């Protein structure tokens, strides 16, 4: 259900048809790997197998060592923000005194608890590994046993199975400094994150959204490291909740429109700098400038409200009509006639201008369409890859009609003798102003 | 073999003599791996060995359970387009009905086939990993004969090797939405991504070049999830082509150049703008104003076509005159006076202003020039670090002969009353006819 | 231990309090890993066993001939080349003879202080001896029992010895030879502890970069550099902190409009110069990019490479905007859009025209409603901030933040003379353009 249109008046496309998933909040829930202190490693003894565990033992207590030692265009209008400030304001709450036996005493019997913290925030707990209980009532003991060796290689191996997500925990937190995204398999396994949805205190519509894009959901995440402190190692995990869904959304594809006059210099051009992407929220439209920051899975698009800005629903008028009254439509003008293409949704944008040979082909019969000077498109149906100079660019193939929508190129309404060529954040209503009083001086200085 | 020239008179510097290795298209390659879905895991039961077998199979089944859920300056002119919209299209056609069972019949009896898909166009497939037959046919047969106990260690960890590749790839795409850039080993072996390059229908020229920088052909290349149908995991890997080599390439370093006067503000500056790759192609130019995203590989130069603009050869010319009438060389002004330090190819260019201590070090001499207030250049010979305030550069110590063509700094030719100090995009001529025409308004109304 | 002011003349907000780590230079280090060149494996591949280390050391050799077959305002800062040092260091590797006296001096011990053929002394390390394992321990046990092992612990033992070499090798095969930030595969914590204190630095600064090693690791790279005669080698690649425990501060900017009811009446500003600023020798090193720049707890760690110098005088930008001792760098325009900037303390809110702009707390949702202008709000009785359809989190770290009133500057411009599209300008540059456009309406008028 996505659909396409191309405005030859302004050089501009919008694919629509899209839904929404925007990340409005956080949510933050603690997950705790209990450990168990190893104080006196006596083992000697030069053999074979009682070398692995001794080995074996020794990166464990290593990697907890080491994780103790770790705690000793216009997208330059939008704000910025702490991405985990709310994760890591919930990570400082678990340093004052008794909260992780507050946890710990929670999770003494299940895996999954709600707690109630000392500033009143209630969290999920999650007990994803228990080491304490495997090294002290299960390996300690078998390894005791027989003086430091063991008889059954397949204890030292359930032992390295189990110590592994441990060391590729600390891993990750070492090169990532406390702090990872996307929130791996290690710190989170499948299962794990899929019970954390269920748990939390969300729409069924919502979490049957985060279950089936788990791995948009691990992108859009945190993994904060938090405290190795009684014999617990916990770490807070903050994972995105989408407090807007469903709703439209559509990008704008823009490219640069000039003039096709003879003489080298002596071009125009003007170009649509509301790029990006554009979701129905809550009466407004959230604009998204960086089209980057946004995945879009199948239909849906994923993006972060963080980097967005909040404008009015009139906004869409710009590709109703770039001069309506009711908006004032952002435009950047330059003198550089340069060639390029951008590739939309379902098309291409061709902005071919001096020599340069811009042409569509198809898989089966070459070069289909020779583009003339000025700003064409080009529907994803018969065409499997655009050339514009030594630039070879391949075509999205999803499936979907296109609407040429045929109009005058804006440029041409302009008089090259009174343009400003060196707008870069102006608009409709500023560079008319700007004529006009470019206009009206020379209008003066000739009455006199 | 290298060369390097410093235009004392526009302040930038141009390094010689590097090759050319533009990626101008893309291969698609389908990669397969063969599972065996089994049902359930019917024995429970405690048993040193067993257990291990049982957990290893819990971790393969839940991988394959995992994968089906899956699948449920200058810069702002280059434009854009859709990087994996190539593979991406390849994906779509195997999920065509019967498409997968033309792939695995053809790689029944081989490991590496060519097919060709029902739209036409012809793949190498590669069967990477056989776990179907490894399971149903050397595994579940040991284990089944002894009720799931097997007397052999040996079995769980030859099981354990064998599904470990199919983990990490399940891992790789569980954190990048199916979508993996470079690709991965445990996606593509060095081995299995040799092979594909020596079958590939490419020159001989092109699959040594390939081969001798397997670590930058993953670099550029995508590998994108598709299918886990039937008894086949496929996903497919889009490699770089280089249609594209051994053409001359050139880098332009440019620096600020402003005025050196004593008064704080009276000052003006100019910048070459068009820093960059360029290298001759198709009797073109294409131009990398993003030197960010190019590859040097001791003498060759990795770049990638869509993150280019293509210019007339004529662009050159702005390294032996400026003032050229056949080609507008790019330029920005400013009135912003700031020091600062670009390294080259071979050597440093000091922009040195105010009273910005600026020095060039010697290793067995400590500091050996100081420079004044201007834009100056230094080779890399004698000299090891050039400091800018309080900043320590190294320098490049890459062998190579360096040229500094004396001229008189641009700036001086520029009247300060009318100097245009505003523009981000402009041009030699640009800034021309803006002083021309202001200069002309100020006659025009002297003449009353 | 943290404070922070917002200039409500100027919309923008300085922290501070900050002590600097900044990187001012590189200490390359060689480490080395001595491999064996194994001639025929003319075993047989019937017993179980016999398969797996046949198998683990075709793996083993596959990895050492893979590795012979790899052989605002931002825009001023200016160009290196990050790596050019650990790089010469490696080009000097090639020259004839130069890798024996790393073999040599590391024949006894681990740990080596070498010196180089060009005069310099660099910190040599044995971080892992797989030649002497295959040779004296793994070989000799093959060979004895008519090419068989009879024990399942020697083949885990070697494939446990293998598996960092062949970590290794899909670092530099997926890197390209360089890789940031060094990982645990390339220098383990213990090693790179052991690195920092045996270099040749203070123990202030051999302090820092041990209680930080995570940071160290981020601002570190991992040369691969030569496999020739026994030895594999890379150059480890480490931040030297030359300016530590000097004043920083960061200054947030937020754009500061005009707030008439007419839709596009409205005038804008905002300051540029945001970033890290820090004191070091006299001058202040100045970091747009903020986002090159970590802190831990209070400490500032930034890269001078990342950074222009400044002089000292900047700071007067936070006492008056419009002195003359140094031209404060501002841009214009005439779009009054809505945002907000969380700073260390607080949060500045840009709230103009009709966007719904609030400030909420976690035990009583909405506590303030801004109005149209650029406010700020400290993090005390705060937890989160709304400017439209967009909720910030604010800092929750402690410190006293101070709310310092003006008029605000943008109040101090003639709307009929103000230049709006101004990216890099500046008090002055703004106020001479005035001059010349309203000089040019005086003409007429004498006229
Ligand atoms: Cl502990
Ligand atoms: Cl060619």
């Known amino acids: 259900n996505i659909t396409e249109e191309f ?3 302004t050089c501009s496309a919008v694919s629509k048809g899209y839904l929404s998933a925007l990340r409005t909040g956080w949510y933050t829930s603690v997950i705790t790997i209990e450990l168990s202190n190893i104080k006196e490693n006596k083992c000697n003894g030069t053999d074979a197998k009682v070398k692995l565990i001794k080995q074996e033992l020794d990166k464990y207590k290593n990697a907890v060592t080491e994780l103790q030692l770790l705690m000793q265009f216009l997208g330059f209008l ?41 500033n ?6 999650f007990k994803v590994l228990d080491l304490k209980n495997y090294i002290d009532k299960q390996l300690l003991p078998i390894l005791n046993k027989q003086s430091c060796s063991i008889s059954n290689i397949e204890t030292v191996i359930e032992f390295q199975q189990k110590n592994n997500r441990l060391l590729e925990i600390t891993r990750e937190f070492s090169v990532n400094a406390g702090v990872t995204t996307p929130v791996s398999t290690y710190m989170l396994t499948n299962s794990e994150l899929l019970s954390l949805i269920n748990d939390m205190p969300i729409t069924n519509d919502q979490k049957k959204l985060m279950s089936n894009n788990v791995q948009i959901v691990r992108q859009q995440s945190y993994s904060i490291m938090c405290i190795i402190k009684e014999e617990v190692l916990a770490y807070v995990v903050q994972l995105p909740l989408y407090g807007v869904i469903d709703t439209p959304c559509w990008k704008l594809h823009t490219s640069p429109l000039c003039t096709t006059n003879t003489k080298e210099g002596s071009n125009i051009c003007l170009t649509r700098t509301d790029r990006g992407w554009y979701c129905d929220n809550a009466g407004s439209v959230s604009f998204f400038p960086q089209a980057e920051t946004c995945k879009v899975q199948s239909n849906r698009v994923f993006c ?15 590709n109703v009509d770039i001069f309506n009254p009711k908006y004032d439509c952002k435009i950047m003008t330059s003198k550089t006639d340069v060639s390029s293409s951008v ?21 089966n019969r070459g070069i289909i369409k020779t583009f003339s000077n000025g700003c064409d498109y080009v529907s994803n149906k018969g065409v499997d890859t655009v050339s514009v100079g030594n630039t070879l660019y391949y075509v999205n193939k999803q499936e979907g009609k296109s609407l040429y929508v045929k109009g005058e190129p804006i440029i041409n309404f302009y008089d090259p003798l009174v343009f400003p060529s060196d707008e870069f954040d ?23």
Chains 1, 2 share one sequence.
Do not use: W
């Not at 902005?351 to 811009?358: A, L, N, P, R, V």
């Not at 560079?431 to 001086?441: G, M, Y």
């Open 7 to 9: 405005y030859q008046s």
């Open 78 to 118: 939008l704000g910025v923000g702490s991405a985990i400030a709310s994760g890591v304001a919930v990570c400082k709450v678990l340093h004052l005194e008794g909260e992780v036996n507050k946890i710990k005493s929670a999770l003494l019997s299940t895996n999954k608890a709600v707690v109630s913290l000392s």
């Open 120 to 125: 009143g925030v209630s969290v999920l707990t």
């Open 304 to 318: 972060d409200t963080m980097n967005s800005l909040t404008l009015p629903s009139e906004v869409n008028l710009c």
């Open 343 to 363: 590739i939309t949704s379902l098309g291409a944008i061709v902005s071919c201008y001096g020599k340069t040979k811009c042409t569509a082909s198809n898989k």
């Open 426 to 448: 102006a608009s409709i209503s500023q560079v008319n102003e700007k004529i006009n009083q470019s206009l009206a001086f020379i209008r003066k200085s000739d009455e006199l």
